[model samples]
Target chain A: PWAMALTPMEFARKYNLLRKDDEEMTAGIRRGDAKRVFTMQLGPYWDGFERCSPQAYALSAVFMARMNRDRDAANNILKVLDKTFVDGKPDFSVARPVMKKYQNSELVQEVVAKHAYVLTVIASLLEAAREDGVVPSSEFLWLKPVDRRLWYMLNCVGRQTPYSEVAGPFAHWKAEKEMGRRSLVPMIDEAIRALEIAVKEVRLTPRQMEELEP
Target chain B: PWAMALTPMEFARKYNLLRKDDALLDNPVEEMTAGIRRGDAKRVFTMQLGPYWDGFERCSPQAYALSAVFMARMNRDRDAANNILKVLDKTFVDGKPDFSVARPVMKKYQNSELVQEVVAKHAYVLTVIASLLEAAREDGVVPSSEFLWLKPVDRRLWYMLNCVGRQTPYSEVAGPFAHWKAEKEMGRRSLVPMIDEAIRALEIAVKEVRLTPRQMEELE
Candidate 1:
């Protein structure tokens, strides 16, 4: 189920704007208004977020190339998606202006696809970057391990397990020295290679590339 | 310069239980969240989301290494951290049959210096992770990005930005292009090298060390 935070009109206006003009908004950096800027850039950001999830089939094929640490690449991609789809108000001002920046381009659709594709490539990098562990619904997001409490929660509960089920795996890691059986370095390299290929295959016009630079 | 959302006693207990038992924490995932509600002033996470902005320093350099791009790493690390921390916490809890796992260590500043070192390195990686947009203030945490609303306020921002850099053409991440005018104007703004250093250092040890199948099963 989708979140019910925004009204239908609000969603439509922002969505339409996102598909069109997005960069012309106040931007707020020079004027120093944060609230306006955040709202403009956040909403409709995630509409393209989930579409960027790593290709699971592609992951296995290239698993052996770099290091085998597929998690790193996967997490990278997920992080980008999460960042792009910040769980905040959709700032139509920002979206409308950004989309409008190149609204009339012949390569508009292609640019959109490339932007969306670039987002996915990033997700794959994140996922491939880390080591894999078994968590059912916890599949989509990247795990920022710095925050100790939230980090503990995912291990203990976020995996959708009772505390009893949780302790089994954690104790194993605490005592053991190494976390993964295989090395993650080469796996990272392999992932990079796969990502490079994707970047190449996606044919973006020079104008589209210029537009997506930031 | 610290604000405890909890009362003194509750806060002290949290510190004693969580801070004291540093090793006791498994795969601790911290976050900074921001949102808007009921037309209220825009909300930002400092201590919200039940995560601490400070405890991040206590973990290893490797832990902080990927934090620069935490969004991706966090998702990836979630499973690994969960699996590993699950095993560790269970062992400790079961080991002390009579005691709750809450209060393991009662000491203050065991490796405070080392913690500081990690924090400094972490800050460096954190800055690059966020593309040098945020500064972890002594007073509070703020999201630092040239582009806001592109990501979350937490470590996820670092990951996503880096993801864009990594997937982007090498020229984008590497920044030889003249149009990176502002990016280059920011002087040493490219994250690719900083990220490369962090990744190289962390993966080095992780690569050399090999865990056996027995170890993997032990995690079960």
Candidate 2:
């Protein structure tokens, strides 16, 4: 839903505004908006000002997909970002204010609703990244089930409210944990089953892909 | 020179940041800073954030040089916000600041400046990446003499600044056209001599490092 609120044309417009002819880029540099300029040119800092979580997630997903040496998955994620953001009459300004209002208005509902798809996407990509050696951890521990350390750091020990809080912060937090645990848990379980079944259907080999299939 | 600021130990310490367990990576659900917390063993973010530009440029250069393909150049760049700010330390307390601040941040004031060497190294690695791809456009018109656009992501654009900014931007807007033109002329003058020296240096180094079996395979 949140992803739907923005589109590709909007991203392109903002991107163009920041980089068109390099004048704005030069101006941003002159004006000491290095962060803006750098991010305009680079994905690493784009999320700082953009404030949309799904876009960030999607961009990252694209990055992982590309890293896996799977051009298809990488392109698919980009298509998702483009279709949602680039309707030709993109207005980044529109999405930001509206998303902010929606986020602020109902914290818990918003977090759960907006992040569910993205969180799931992140989990699966992490698995693939690890397996492919695009990522380092072979245990897949870093990705599988998703590390809850940040949750422990920010919300638990830090006493900071989670980044999103649609329902009351506490309830929101609990529900998020539950949703991540209970919801994706079953789906992931099913995914592993399907993968194993497919692996069984094929003639396997000593190749890395076949070896790591399940 | 800025290079003098870091002894070998410092370079090694800086180098280890990238090679660390979970470095340049994050769990997907964690996403962004959330992923960082999950991955990092100790809190490197504080020091990394404090020295953002130096760390980023150095890390990128190292990653490029090491030819580590899976390393997350853009992802980490996107994820590491506080560190990216250290690259250009300007506060927008006032609306927009002058581009001049970049001179101090990326170029002069810092102990580790992003200069021609780093720029060249970046270009070199990109050249490496292109080579790895089956269809690198090596023979085509090189669009910009000072910059070799690597592909969709990174470029050695600042090579223009290092090599001959005057012919490009410095001579155009930042004034001092005469000075820039002179630099361009000098660059043209030195090109042949520079190439000769580079060729000789590499030719000499070639004898020292033999390709390992893996390296031989990659070459094949």
Candidate 3:
């Protein structure tokens, strides 16, 4: 707490703490101690370092979710990562520690817990697909089962995806077209029944209401 | 290879190698070391290593295809294959393409379908190809992107390798690359890593199967 302090560049060099991006990306991410709402929504990895790329923060969310044990979200984030990176494997040296440090972070736990509730529903909905003799795989991950819808609401609300995903590109339909079944009804109804348990667990922001609108 | 010789249990004890899938002991690493000393090595890698690296990892379908290319390339080129053995225990005699390595073997695998058909008689290469039939499907997993490579050509590459594995007389795999080159060549030339070694390797694989002007043209 003295007047002695180094600038970010000097500090970055002094600790040898530069976690720079591979030249694959234009810029990189820093810590998230600022507690900004929108940035936190993409999920957690902010640690009070000066901010930089949204891609970095987005990846932080990916690892934070991975550390929290969201297996499929790893793919969700990887898809986003591949949209920009050829090898989206984050620098493990930096990412691994940041994840451990972020353990018990309020926002980290919040999003992690929210994502967990959503998965319970995705699990049930996918089970319903199995009931109908359709083996649920990544092909049906984008289906309109309530769990997937709620799960979509959870992730589709992130800065990585934003509200633009709801209508802008039809992202799910495009990704799911390889196995688009022309059947419907019972599984979706079962998924909605499964979602009731999760509905109270989620805390929606105002922007997410746009997702609930339809 | 023997009880008093440099064996797995002693090696496990030496490295403190632990297993997590079953109860090895009140303490597993020691227990597994004892198990190895007593008789067996057990199916260890199907589960965890220990408290270190702390990651529960899976072998990805994306990784399956990528590893096939790189690992095959490493065998085809002696650099990685020989160095792995040379570093592991130094059992490699002179480190040339002898019985100690696959660099020469993989060349024969690449050179002729006759070798491939018979190699399948003694090879797991056929089984690996069978797995790829499901593994390299168009969708499900996200595409893989290695450094200096283009996006997700695993599909066509799998087909090419599948043909090689089955010893297919006529390969349709080269046709996709021909169309892919025409489609992507417009603006994507600069963005790619632009290495000649990959081009040359593909040319080797391509010319072995069939010859078409378009396939050779892009590699040219």
Candidate 4:
């Protein structure tokens, strides 16, 4: 279970700002554990990041940036992720071998889904950080191809394998057994929605911000 | 305007085929690619003038690849395609193919129209080749990784060819082909339309072949 690399109080503050719910969600954030936080936010069955999935670090980075309002922590996480995943550019040359053998494994299915979610969230967080006057040092956060890499990854590896015993039972349990029925277009729409909001919500000049307040 | 490979008569024939007119447009698909090559050659021949024209070995991989595809598809000669590809492997360094074959031959035919013709044809052929290889890959017919070499090879050829044209308008310091600079010159920029049309035709062929397996069988 990947947990936020944040203090309970730090997580608590950011959590309160987003929901603005009088710290109703702060106790979960105060726990400083992602599995507990995610299970609380989502559902109990939400097993967080697993090993052999890059989403662990990516999701944590976005969560930290959004919740703690800490751009540097988000950027630091990106640096580590890029060195391990992106390496030189938005290329799969290095990242392809990471889970190539797990082709069709339900773990890969989970990884791909989580990866898409994290990319969508991070893109929004980055747009928000820029709006909040925090520029990240990571090139991956700024490039178009890097943003598109998630789409490409899903296309390349999201198909079901005939040999996937784990994926088969997992699909049966979820009641969604057909690969053809699954689509990333809705997830892409969600990302676009997040990006649009961040662009609209950024802090402007004091006069501009005040005028738009109503 | 960049024209498709079909002749006026051939186009009319194909037009009638869709209207269920006749089989005049039933020529092999190879002939379609051949018409493209010939059309490209006409454009190159009309566009530039030069000397000491030799075929096959001296042009860029772009030219060789184009010729190779034409030979493979038009003539049912994979051997010629392989041979052309072989020369590219032997000649290029780090994906850069030399069209400097113009300079040495330019010595004897310094004032001839053949020099510009050879250079322009080299540029045009390479552009067409790159476009064809691209379409070939899209069709899933390109035999190996060799076709991918056309991308960088075209980049290098375009850079050098444009450099030659850009550097030509000057004086004696540049070299032999540099001396005969015309007021206007064609380059990689000029060839884009021809290349685009070739790709469009090849793609159409791929789709048509898929639609009519019997016609594709006839082409083979």
Off by over 4 Å in 4: A1-210, B1-21, B24-220
**Cα RMSD for candidate 3?**
27.6
Question: What TM-score would every model get versus the actual structure?
Answer: 0.19, 0.22, 0.22, 0.21
lDDT tens per residue, model 2, B99-185: 232232233212222223232222222222222111112222111211111111121222222222123221111112222233234
Give the lowest summed-lDDT range of ten residues in model 4 chain A.
A161-170
lDDT of 3 by residue, A168-210 (tens): 1122222222224211111122222222222333344445333
Q: How many clashing residue pairs are found in candidate 1? A: 80
CA lDDT, every model vs. true structure: 0.27, 0.26, 0.29, 0.32
Report the candidate with higher DockQ, 2 versus 4.
4
Question: For every candidate structure, what is the RMSD over all alpha carbons to the true structure, in angstroms?
Answer: 28.3, 26.1, 27.6, 20.5
Q: Model 3 clash pairs?
A: A31-A47, A32-A46, A32-A47, A33-A48
lDDT of 1 by residue, A59-176 (tens): 2122212123334543444334334333322111222322233333333332233222222222222233232454222332222212222223233422332221112222222212
The 10-residue segment with the lowest total lDDT in model 3 chain A: A182-191
- What total of clashing residue pairs does each candidate reach? 80, 23, 4, 11
RMSD of 4: 20.5
Total residue pair clashes for candidate 4: 11
